[PDB]
Amino acid sequence: DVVKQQPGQMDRYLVYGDEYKALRDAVAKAVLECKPLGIKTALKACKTPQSQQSAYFLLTLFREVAILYRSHNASLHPTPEQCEAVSKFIGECKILSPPDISRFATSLVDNSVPLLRDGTVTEMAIHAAAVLLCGQ
């Protein structure tokens, strides 16, 4: 039945735990609805320090938006309106205010990230990027 039953992929960032999952689901819902306020609620509800908050935010931005950008089927690509909502929200957010974090996030939402035009390499790369940026 396996071959008859059959495109979702895994998310190894789940290694962080429940808080990344919550923030990721919140970001996905808020981007699809394009009303970036649940993002604020998730960022306030979370338990971890500011730098881990920013890292989780960056990883969610990548997993949802940048991977959607990697599909050949353009209709799945993030809509300009979603870019508008998340770009504005990043601009008004403070833990993302560090020019490097804000630039990297915005580049994920706008696909202007170098290295982000393999999958496992790309995922480890973006994880290292987030950790280095946010790691003080």
Curated annotation (Swiss-Prot):
Induction and repression of expression: Down-regulated by let-7c miRNA, which binds to the 3'-UTR transcript of RNF213. Induced by pro-inflammatory cytokines.
Highest taxon of source: Eukaryota
Subcellular location: Cytoplasm, Cytosol; Lipid droplet
Phenotype for residue 53 to L: Rare variant detected in a sporadic case of Moyamoya disease in East Asian population
Summary of the tissues where the protein is detected: Widely expressed (at protein level).
Post-translational modification: Autoubiquitinated.
Domain notes: Composed of an N-terminal stalk, a dynein-like core comprised of two catalytically active and four inactive ATPase domains, and a C-terminal E3 module. The ATPase regions do not generate movement but rather act like an intricate molecular 'switch'. The RING-type zinc finger domain is required for the ubiquitin-protein ligase activity.
Oligomeric and partner information: Monomer. Interacts with UBE2L3/UBCH7; UBE2L3/UBCH7 is the most efficient ubiquitin-conjugating enzyme E2 for the ubiquitin ligase activity. Interacts with UBE2N/UBC13; promoting 'Lys-63'-linked ubiquitination of target proteins. (Microbial infection) Interacts with M.tuberculosis protein Rv3655c, which impairs caspase-8 activation and suppresses macrophage apoptosis by blocking the extrinsic pathway.
Primary role: Atypical E3 ubiquitin ligase that can catalyze ubiquitination of both proteins and lipids, and which is involved in various processes, such as lipid metabolism, angiogenesis and cell-autonomous immunity. Acts as a key immune sensor by catalyzing ubiquitination of the lipid A moiety of bacterial lipopolysaccharide (LPS) via its RZ-type zinc-finger: restricts the proliferation of cytosolic bacteria, such as Salmonella, by generating the bacterial ubiquitin coat through the ubiquitination of LPS.
Disease: Moyamoya disease 2: A progressive cerebral angiopathy characterized by bilateral intracranial carotid artery stenosis and telangiectatic vessels in the region of the basal ganglia. The abnormal vessels resemble a 'puff of smoke' (moyamoya) on cerebral angiogram. Affected individuals can develop transient ischemic attacks and/or cerebral infarction, and rupture of the collateral vessels can cause intracranial hemorrhage. Hemiplegia of sudden onset and epileptic seizures constitute the prevailing presentation in childhood, while subarachnoid bleeding occurs more frequently in adults. A chromosomal aberration involving RNF213 is associated with anaplastic large-cell lymphoma (ALCL). Translocation t(2;17)(p23;q25) with ALK.
Family as reported in the entry's similarity comment: Belongs to the AAA ATPase family.
Protein name: E3 ubiquitin-protein ligase RNF213
